[PDB]
Amino acid sequence: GREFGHLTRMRHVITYSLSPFEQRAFPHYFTKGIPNVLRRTRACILRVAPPFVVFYLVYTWGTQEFEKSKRKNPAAYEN
Amino acid sequence: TNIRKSHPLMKIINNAFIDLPAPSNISSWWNFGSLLGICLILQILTGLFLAMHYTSDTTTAFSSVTHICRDVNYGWVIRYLHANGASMFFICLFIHVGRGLYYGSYMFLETWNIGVVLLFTVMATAFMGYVLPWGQMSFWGATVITNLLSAIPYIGTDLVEWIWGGFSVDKATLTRFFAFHFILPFIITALAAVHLLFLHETGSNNPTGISSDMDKIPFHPYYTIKDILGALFMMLILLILVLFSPDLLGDPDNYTPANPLNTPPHIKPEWYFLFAYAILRSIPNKLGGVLALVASILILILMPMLHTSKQRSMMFRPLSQCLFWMLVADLITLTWIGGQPVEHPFIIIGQLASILYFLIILVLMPITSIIENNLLKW
Amino acid sequence: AAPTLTARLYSLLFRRTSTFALTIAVGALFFERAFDQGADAIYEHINQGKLWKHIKHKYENK
Amino acid sequence: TDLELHAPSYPWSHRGLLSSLDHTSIRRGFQVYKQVCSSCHSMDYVAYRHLVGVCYTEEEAKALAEEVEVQDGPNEDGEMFMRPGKLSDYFPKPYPNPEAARAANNGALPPDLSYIVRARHGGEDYVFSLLTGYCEPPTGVSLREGLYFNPYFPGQAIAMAPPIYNEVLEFDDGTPATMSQVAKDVCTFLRWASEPEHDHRKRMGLKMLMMMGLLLPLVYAMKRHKWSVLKSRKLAYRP
Amino acid sequence: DPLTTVREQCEQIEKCIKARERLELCDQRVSSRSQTEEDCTEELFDFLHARDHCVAHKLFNSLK
Ligand code: HEC
Ligand code: HEM
Ligand code: HEM
Ligand SMILES: Cc1cc(C)c2nc(SCc3c(C)cccc3-n3nnn(C)c3=O)sc2c1
Ligand SMILES: Cc1cc(C)c2nc(SCc3c(C)cccc3-n3nnn(C)c3=O)sc2c1
């Protein structure tokens, strides 16, 4: 029901484009690419990283109170 | 005559895959729908090979699986494709559901509700197949489910002595486990066709949440080449597991044959059932355990009416994104706890994380979206 | 404006689209000639004196 | 039931991503199977046919199946008769039924060895540390009438006498048959017995990794060619 | 024979004499009172862990 000549109504916008054979394959790869992924990462990590830092501190405490109870008892084996 | 537009079969292919209008800013999180369809076809063809040499009898079930890995030609590669292809299915399925939850795709109501049905049917299928080899996890996995399935108040004990053939454990026992496991993947296929028929009425969502009818591109060639590339990158990772570490995800205890006499040192399911197992063992009851296991998949169907934000996706909502990855880091906690023994530190951590899974979805998320509406003045 | 050697095959065969879909068949040849020189020979070189056909000359002396 | 001792990691020569099994250490490990065990342990899934091209030729394999005669089935003008090995025979079992096996071995049943490294949490690191880890009981523990102290076994008390010591057998290679040499060879054999596809597995994994190294960077360049139309587009708005 | 060589040379390390110290410090203390449930199967494990970690790094050179 929704094909290309029936989607919206749009006025006064213009598009310019080049052929794929008139373009070189890598305009930039490492001079554009490295600073763009360094700011996409700065925007991410203070939303994503702090929940996984709290799982790490629970894993480290939980696998340290199991070993102190599975018979590491020198002074907890008194008459 | 354009024959792509006038032939009765070629019209359907052209409207569904070639001339389909698609958003231009679709990410690679939208790759995992066709990856799920590749993983389903792979499990069907490989499973139809194993079913010509398997024997469903509790005296010769374990011995017919060792025979195909040693005697039948290319039986060892096809068996470990099947076991590792099922882990591949469940990792793509959890990415797929988490995508639709973060971007707000559950607003396609008929597409979301067929999806929650498909999630139950693949979880029940994978349970039946892990009973069929009959080692010491197929035994102590089957009995833990079916004494938990005798705690249904009025028809419970009627249903437990139906699936074993009527007896306790015998030859005719795994004919019913095998016949369910044969049939359910072909119903999953029919439900996935209806799934895409309802999505064809609106087209796709996009990472901004905003409608994109002024910026469509055709599906061919832009997403036919992007989906082929993601499928090749998935067949690479699967074969790294089959050919360089085929026993990494399994357990060694399933290479001992089932014995009601001997004793297994621990009870550990597959990694993708370990989160549900941790919610079970936190409820000291056997009716309230099977209820809270079924309510952890069925809470997905309340996501359309719990939505109180003015915007559709989480791209522009920074407080809802801290709660989304608190929920992912809580399903990692429940996977670790489900593979630990039941002693003191892992018993309070396990039940304080079963509470947090329901407190985030039902209470903390709808209140946080209202605070965000008020800081933007709607 | 001396260009680089891109257009070896743009004009003759890969223009009529014939050899574009034929290179899966016509172009199926001589790379299982060329990659025994790889994988097989790298395999017996990492494992030297450890395989059967290395050591089988001892009991094969009839 | 307090804490376990977990086996250390040894540098086996098949612990690489492309490293094969040593096929002379398999050959010396079958002979420690067939002179030291084979008497308390079974190996139900391996036949004499499985050793042709691995550590023996076909002759040297018929002539080893000859060495024990077997109990064939019924025929007319006779009985269930007897006959030497046919090279299609599995390795001959060592206890009439499961019940004789208990009384011959202090109530404990000795396990089948066809899947033993695959069915242990630690593999051949566990089997090596078991056979060379027998020691004396510490002061405080007592044991039963026939029951021995082994610290790397679930609950130190094993119902198994130490089965290998110095010069238990003689290898037909001139290799000195000390205690550590013979334990190293029944870990290599019994890794082959569990995983007989080990070497074929790692050689298909290299013929996949370099015929994907042709196919992947060239579907990626086809993708980047189509999408450059959209990545270079410019937009203007003129109301 | 190569094992008894290696196992003795690595038994004089700052972790394995430090474990032998507490071991016979407690070995002497169990046998006195004859109604006691105290073992030292613990104490043996701290020594065998420290020792067997160093045997594995050195033993496979001397074999085959
Ligand atoms: C004459 C008796 C006897 C011989 C010979 C013997 N064993 Fe054992 N072994 C046993 C008994 C009995 C058990 C069961 C132990 C138990 O349950 O305590 C056992 C168990 C084992 C186990 C399993 C331990 C576990 O965790 O289940 C391994 C591995 C093993 N033996 C290795 C060997 C190897 C390798 C050889 C010879 C090359 C060997 N054994 C020879 C008596 C023997
Ligand atoms: C075997 C199972 C499934 C298959 C084969 C499958 C297949 C697909 C495919 C091919 C798409 C279109 C492409 C894409 O966006 O990735 C899609 C979209 C979608 N699926 Fe699934 N799916 C399955 C399970 C599920 C589940 C379990 C859910 C949710 C509970 C779900 C919900 C959705 C939604 C909401 C969309 C539209 C998303 C959007 O456009 O933003 N599906 N599915
Ligand atoms: C969504 C599809 C499927 C999933 C997730 C799935 C999952 C599984 C799993 C996890 C096992 C246990 C294997 C092991 O760990 O050893 C198994 C076994 C088995 N499956 Fe499947 N399966 C699927 C489809 C099928 C189909 C369609 C068939 C048959 C037509 C099939 C036939 C078998 C057989 C015969 C076995 C027993 C042999 C063996 O254990 O290897 N499977 N399946
Ligand atoms: C390689 C390959 C081939 C095929 C044939 C293929 N087919 C699909 S399903 C197309 C679809 C339908 C039918 C209906 C509604 C929406 C979408 N759709 N829209 N966007 N995306 C990402 C979608 O999948 S993926 C895929 C990948
Ligand atoms: C919807 C649904 C249905 C079922 C039936 C279900 N069952 C589980 S846990 C089963 C289990 C146990 C308790 C112990 C050992 C092994 C296995 N087990 N069985 N199959 N697989 C792949 C396993 O890991 S969650 C779940 C969710």
PDB file of N, CA and C in Angstrom, chain B residues 159-218:
ATOM      1  N   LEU B 159      -0.112 -34.338  34.204  1.00  0.00           N
ATOM      2  CA  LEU B 159       0.716 -33.960  33.063  1.00  0.00           C
ATOM      3  C   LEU B 159       2.136 -34.502  33.190  1.00  0.00           C
ATOM      4  N   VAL B 160       2.573 -34.838  34.406  1.00  0.00           N
ATOM      5  CA  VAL B 160       3.916 -35.388  34.567  1.00  0.00           C
ATOM      6  C   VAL B 160       4.000 -36.848  34.146  1.00  0.00           C
ATOM      7  N   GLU B 161       2.990 -37.679  34.386  1.00  0.00           N
ATOM      8  CA  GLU B 161       3.025 -39.050  33.895  1.00  0.00           C
ATOM      9  C   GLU B 161       2.395 -39.192  32.516  1.00  0.00           C
ATOM     10  N   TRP B 162       2.399 -38.129  31.715  1.00  0.00           N
ATOM     11  CA  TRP B 162       2.089 -38.216  30.297  1.00  0.00           C
ATOM     12  C   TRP B 162       3.328 -38.133  29.420  1.00  0.00           C
ATOM     13  N   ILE B 163       4.326 -37.338  29.803  1.00  0.00           N
ATOM     14  CA  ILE B 163       5.449 -37.071  28.918  1.00  0.00           C
ATOM     15  C   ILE B 163       6.498 -38.169  28.974  1.00  0.00           C
ATOM     16  N   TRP B 164       6.523 -38.971  30.040  1.00  0.00           N
ATOM     17  CA  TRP B 164       7.445 -40.095  30.102  1.00  0.00           C
ATOM     18  C   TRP B 164       6.872 -41.345  29.455  1.00  0.00           C
ATOM     19  N   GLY B 165       5.743 -41.238  28.764  1.00  0.00           N
ATOM     20  CA  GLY B 165       5.071 -42.382  28.193  1.00  0.00           C
ATOM     21  C   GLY B 165       4.117 -43.082  29.133  1.00  0.00           C
ATOM     22  N   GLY B 166       3.961 -42.536  30.342  1.00  0.00           N
ATOM     23  CA  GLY B 166       3.090 -43.167  31.351  1.00  0.00           C
ATOM     24  C   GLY B 166       3.891 -43.820  32.464  1.00  0.00           C
ATOM     25  N   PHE B 167       5.100 -44.294  32.145  1.00  0.00           N
ATOM     26  CA  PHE B 167       5.974 -44.965  33.141  1.00  0.00           C
ATOM     27  C   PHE B 167       6.909 -43.937  33.784  1.00  0.00           C
ATOM     28  N   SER B 168       7.990 -44.442  34.474  1.00  0.00           N
ATOM     29  CA  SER B 168       8.883 -43.484  35.177  1.00  0.00           C
ATOM     30  C   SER B 168       9.910 -42.952  34.176  1.00  0.00           C
ATOM     31  N   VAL B 169      10.846 -43.965  33.790  1.00  0.00           N
ATOM     32  CA  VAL B 169      11.817 -43.700  32.685  1.00  0.00           C
ATOM     33  C   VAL B 169      12.042 -45.027  31.956  1.00  0.00           C
ATOM     34  N   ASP B 170      11.821 -45.052  30.639  1.00  0.00           N
ATOM     35  CA  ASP B 170      11.950 -46.316  29.866  1.00  0.00           C
ATOM     36  C   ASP B 170      12.254 -45.998  28.399  1.00  0.00           C
ATOM     37  N   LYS B 171      12.031 -46.965  27.510  1.00  0.00           N
ATOM     38  CA  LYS B 171      12.319 -46.767  26.066  1.00  0.00           C
ATOM     39  C   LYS B 171      11.303 -45.788  25.476  1.00  0.00           C
ATOM     40  N   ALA B 172      10.006 -46.049  25.665  1.00  0.00           N
ATOM     41  CA  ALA B 172       8.963 -45.191  25.052  1.00  0.00           C
ATOM     42  C   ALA B 172       8.974 -43.798  25.689  1.00  0.00           C
ATOM     43  N   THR B 173       9.929 -43.529  26.581  1.00  0.00           N
ATOM     44  CA  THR B 173       9.954 -42.247  27.268  1.00  0.00           C
ATOM     45  C   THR B 173      10.409 -41.127  26.352  1.00  0.00           C
ATOM     46  N   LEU B 174      11.511 -41.328  25.640  1.00  0.00           N
ATOM     47  CA  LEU B 174      12.030 -40.259  24.811  1.00  0.00           C
ATOM     48  C   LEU B 174      11.475 -40.301  23.398  1.00  0.00           C
ATOM     49  N   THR B 175      10.385 -41.022  23.158  1.00  0.00           N
ATOM     50  CA  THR B 175       9.691 -40.849  21.891  1.00  0.00           C
ATOM     51  C   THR B 175       8.827 -39.601  21.888  1.00  0.00           C
ATOM     52  N   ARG B 176       8.354 -39.154  23.027  1.00  0.00           N
ATOM     53  CA  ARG B 176       7.479 -37.984  23.166  1.00  0.00           C
ATOM     54  C   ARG B 176       8.349 -36.749  23.254  1.00  0.00           C
ATOM     55  N   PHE B 177       9.475 -36.806  23.947  1.00  0.00           N
ATOM     56  CA  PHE B 177      10.430 -35.706  23.936  1.00  0.00           C
ATOM     57  C   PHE B 177      10.968 -35.450  22.540  1.00  0.00           C
ATOM     58  N   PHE B 178      11.175 -36.507  21.764  1.00  0.00           N
ATOM     59  CA  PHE B 178      11.732 -36.383  20.426  1.00  0.00           C
ATOM     60  C   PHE B 178      10.704 -35.851  19.440  1.00  0.00           C
ATOM     61  N   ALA B 179       9.437 -36.229  19.606  1.00  0.00           N
ATOM     62  CA  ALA B 179       8.413 -35.832  18.647  1.00  0.00           C
ATOM     63  C   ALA B 179       7.992 -34.378  18.838  1.00  0.00           C
ATOM     64  N   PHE B 180       7.973 -33.892  20.081  1.00  0.00           N
ATOM     65  CA  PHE B 180       7.800 -32.460  20.321  1.00  0.00           C
ATOM     66  C   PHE B 180       8.951 -31.667  19.726  1.00  0.00           C
ATOM     67  N   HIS B 181      10.170 -32.166  19.904  1.00  0.00           N
ATOM     68  CA  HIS B 181      11.357 -31.442  19.484  1.00  0.00           C
ATOM     69  C   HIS B 181      11.514 -31.427  17.972  1.00  0.00           C
ATOM     70  N   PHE B 182      10.942 -32.403  17.290  1.00  0.00           N
ATOM     71  CA  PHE B 182      10.889 -32.419  15.841  1.00  0.00           C
ATOM     72  C   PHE B 182       9.923 -31.383  15.289  1.00  0.00           C
ATOM     73  N   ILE B 183       8.788 -31.168  15.947  1.00  0.00           N
ATOM     74  CA  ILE B 183       7.657 -30.488  15.323  1.00  0.00           C
ATOM     75  C   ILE B 183       7.685 -28.983  15.578  1.00  0.00           C
ATOM     76  N   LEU B 184       8.106 -28.568  16.769  1.00  0.00           N
ATOM     77  CA  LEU B 184       8.063 -27.158  17.157  1.00  0.00           C
ATOM     78  C   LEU B 184       8.888 -26.201  16.292  1.00  0.00           C
ATOM     79  N   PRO B 185      10.126 -26.547  15.776  1.00  0.00           N
ATOM     80  CA  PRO B 185      10.803 -25.618  14.859  1.00  0.00           C
ATOM     81  C   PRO B 185      10.089 -25.303  13.553  1.00  0.00           C
ATOM     82  N   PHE B 186       9.137 -26.130  13.143  1.00  0.00           N
ATOM     83  CA  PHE B 186       8.374 -25.857  11.938  1.00  0.00           C
ATOM     84  C   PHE B 186       7.142 -25.004  12.189  1.00  0.00           C
ATOM     85  N   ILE B 187       6.743 -24.852  13.445  1.00  0.00           N
ATOM     86  CA  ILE B 187       5.718 -23.902  13.854  1.00  0.00           C
ATOM     87  C   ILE B 187       6.321 -22.521  14.090  1.00  0.00           C
ATOM     88  N   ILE B 188       7.562 -22.480  14.578  1.00  0.00           N
ATOM     89  CA  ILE B 188       8.376 -21.276  14.708  1.00  0.00           C
ATOM     90  C   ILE B 188       8.555 -20.606  13.347  1.00  0.00           C
ATOM     91  N   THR B 189       8.710 -21.410  12.296  1.00  0.00           N
ATOM     92  CA  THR B 189       8.844 -20.880  10.945  1.00  0.00           C
ATOM     93  C   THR B 189       7.554 -20.212  10.474  1.00  0.00           C
ATOM     94  N   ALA B 190       6.405 -20.811  10.790  1.00  0.00           N
ATOM     95  CA  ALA B 190       5.126 -20.245  10.376  1.00  0.00           C
ATOM     96  C   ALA B 190       4.785 -18.972  11.144  1.00  0.00           C
ATOM     97  N   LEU B 191       5.162 -18.899  12.415  1.00  0.00           N
ATOM     98  CA  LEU B 191       4.960 -17.692  13.201  1.00  0.00           C
ATOM     99  C   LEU B 191       5.896 -16.560  12.818  1.00  0.00           C
ATOM    100  N   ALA B 192       7.021 -16.853  12.177  1.00  0.00           N
ATOM    101  CA  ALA B 192       7.935 -15.811  11.740  1.00  0.00           C
ATOM    102  C   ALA B 192       7.535 -15.224  10.398  1.00  0.00           C
ATOM    103  N   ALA B 193       6.767 -15.957   9.599  1.00  0.00           N
ATOM    104  CA  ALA B 193       6.197 -15.380   8.391  1.00  0.00           C
ATOM    105  C   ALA B 193       5.083 -14.393   8.709  1.00  0.00           C
ATOM    106  N   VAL B 194       4.266 -14.681   9.722  1.00  0.00           N
ATOM    107  CA  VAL B 194       3.170 -13.799  10.106  1.00  0.00           C
ATOM    108  C   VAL B 194       3.714 -12.551  10.777  1.00  0.00           C
ATOM    109  N   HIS B 195       4.801 -12.721  11.511  1.00  0.00           N
ATOM    110  CA  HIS B 195       5.603 -11.685  12.139  1.00  0.00           C
ATOM    111  C   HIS B 195       6.054 -10.592  11.177  1.00  0.00           C
ATOM    112  N   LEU B 196       6.493 -10.986   9.989  1.00  0.00           N
ATOM    113  CA  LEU B 196       6.968 -10.033   9.000  1.00  0.00           C
ATOM    114  C   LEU B 196       5.833  -9.454   8.171  1.00  0.00           C
ATOM    115  N   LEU B 197       4.725 -10.186   8.045  1.00  0.00           N
ATOM    116  CA  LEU B 197       3.538  -9.673   7.375  1.00  0.00           C
ATOM    117  C   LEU B 197       2.936  -8.477   8.105  1.00  0.00           C
ATOM    118  N   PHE B 198       2.993  -8.453   9.432  1.00  0.00           N
ATOM    119  CA  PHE B 198       2.477  -7.301  10.156  1.00  0.00           C
ATOM    120  C   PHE B 198       3.461  -6.137  10.162  1.00  0.00           C
ATOM    121  N   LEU B 199       4.753  -6.404   9.993  1.00  0.00           N
ATOM    122  CA  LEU B 199       5.718  -5.316   9.921  1.00  0.00           C
ATOM    123  C   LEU B 199       5.688  -4.628   8.558  1.00  0.00           C
ATOM    124  N   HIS B 200       5.290  -5.346   7.509  1.00  0.00           N
ATOM    125  CA  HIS B 200       5.156  -4.774   6.171  1.00  0.00           C
ATOM    126  C   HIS B 200       4.084  -3.690   6.078  1.00  0.00           C
ATOM    127  N   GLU B 201       3.213  -3.574   7.080  1.00  0.00           N
ATOM    128  CA  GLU B 201       2.180  -2.548   7.077  1.00  0.00           C
ATOM    129  C   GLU B 201       2.713  -1.177   7.459  1.00  0.00           C
ATOM    130  N   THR B 202       3.779  -1.104   8.246  1.00  0.00           N
ATOM    131  CA  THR B 202       4.343   0.178   8.630  1.00  0.00           C
ATOM    132  C   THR B 202       5.752   0.431   8.119  1.00  0.00           C
ATOM    133  N   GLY B 203       6.503  -0.600   7.746  1.00  0.00           N
ATOM    134  CA  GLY B 203       7.932  -0.436   7.578  1.00  0.00           C
ATOM    135  C   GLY B 203       8.656  -0.406   8.918  1.00  0.00           C
ATOM    136  N   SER B 204       9.941  -0.086   8.865  1.00  0.00           N
ATOM    137  CA  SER B 204      10.796  -0.157  10.036  1.00  0.00           C
ATOM    138  C   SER B 204      10.857   1.152  10.808  1.00  0.00           C
ATOM    139  N   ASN B 205      11.178   1.017  12.087  1.00  0.00           N
ATOM    140  CA  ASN B 205      11.616   2.074  12.973  1.00  0.00           C
ATOM    141  C   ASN B 205      13.083   2.393  12.649  1.00  0.00           C
ATOM    142  N   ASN B 206      13.626   3.453  13.230  1.00  0.00           N
ATOM    143  CA  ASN B 206      14.988   3.884  12.963  1.00  0.00           C
ATOM    144  C   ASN B 206      15.554   4.406  14.278  1.00  0.00           C
ATOM    145  N   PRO B 207      16.907   4.551  14.415  1.00  0.00           N
ATOM    146  CA  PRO B 207      17.478   4.964  15.710  1.00  0.00           C
ATOM    147  C   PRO B 207      17.052   6.300  16.312  1.00  0.00           C
ATOM    148  N   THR B 208      16.463   7.207  15.546  1.00  0.00           N
ATOM    149  CA  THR B 208      16.025   8.477  16.114  1.00  0.00           C
ATOM    150  C   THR B 208      14.638   8.405  16.729  1.00  0.00           C
ATOM    151  N   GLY B 209      13.825   7.425  16.340  1.00  0.00           N
ATOM    152  CA  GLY B 209      12.446   7.352  16.751  1.00  0.00           C
ATOM    153  C   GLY B 209      11.479   8.139  15.895  1.00  0.00           C
ATOM    154  N   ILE B 210      11.973   9.016  15.032  1.00  0.00           N
ATOM    155  CA  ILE B 210      11.166   9.942  14.253  1.00  0.00           C
ATOM    156  C   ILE B 210      10.844   9.285  12.920  1.00  0.00           C
ATOM    157  N   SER B 211       9.622   9.488  12.426  1.00  0.00           N
ATOM    158  CA  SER B 211       9.200   8.910  11.154  1.00  0.00           C
ATOM    159  C   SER B 211      10.015   9.452   9.985  1.00  0.00           C
ATOM    160  N   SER B 212      10.256   8.590   9.006  1.00  0.00           N
ATOM    161  CA  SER B 212      11.231   8.857   7.962  1.00  0.00           C
ATOM    162  C   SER B 212      10.659   8.691   6.559  1.00  0.00           C
ATOM    163  N   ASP B 213       9.422   9.118   6.319  1.00  0.00           N
ATOM    164  CA  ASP B 213       8.810   8.879   5.016  1.00  0.00           C
ATOM    165  C   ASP B 213       9.366   9.808   3.941  1.00  0.00           C
ATOM    166  N   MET B 214      10.038  10.885   4.347  1.00  0.00           N
ATOM    167  CA  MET B 214      10.723  11.785   3.430  1.00  0.00           C
ATOM    168  C   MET B 214      12.157  11.355   3.097  1.00  0.00           C
ATOM    169  N   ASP B 215      12.636  10.220   3.606  1.00  0.00           N
ATOM    170  CA  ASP B 215      14.012   9.793   3.360  1.00  0.00           C
ATOM    171  C   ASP B 215      14.140   8.290   3.108  1.00  0.00           C
ATOM    172  N   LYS B 216      13.293   7.714   2.271  1.00  0.00           N
ATOM    173  CA  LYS B 216      13.396   6.287   2.007  1.00  0.00           C
ATOM    174  C   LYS B 216      14.392   5.991   0.883  1.00  0.00           C
ATOM    175  N   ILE B 217      14.972   4.793   0.935  1.00  0.00           N
ATOM    176  CA  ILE B 217      15.789   4.234  -0.148  1.00  0.00           C
ATOM    177  C   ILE B 217      15.306   2.823  -0.433  1.00  0.00           C
ATOM    178  N   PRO B 218      15.539   2.317  -1.647  1.00  0.00           N
ATOM    179  CA  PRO B 218      15.119   0.934  -1.929  1.00  0.00           C
ATOM    180  C   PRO B 218      15.964  -0.089  -1.180  1.00  0.00           C
TER     181      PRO B 218
END
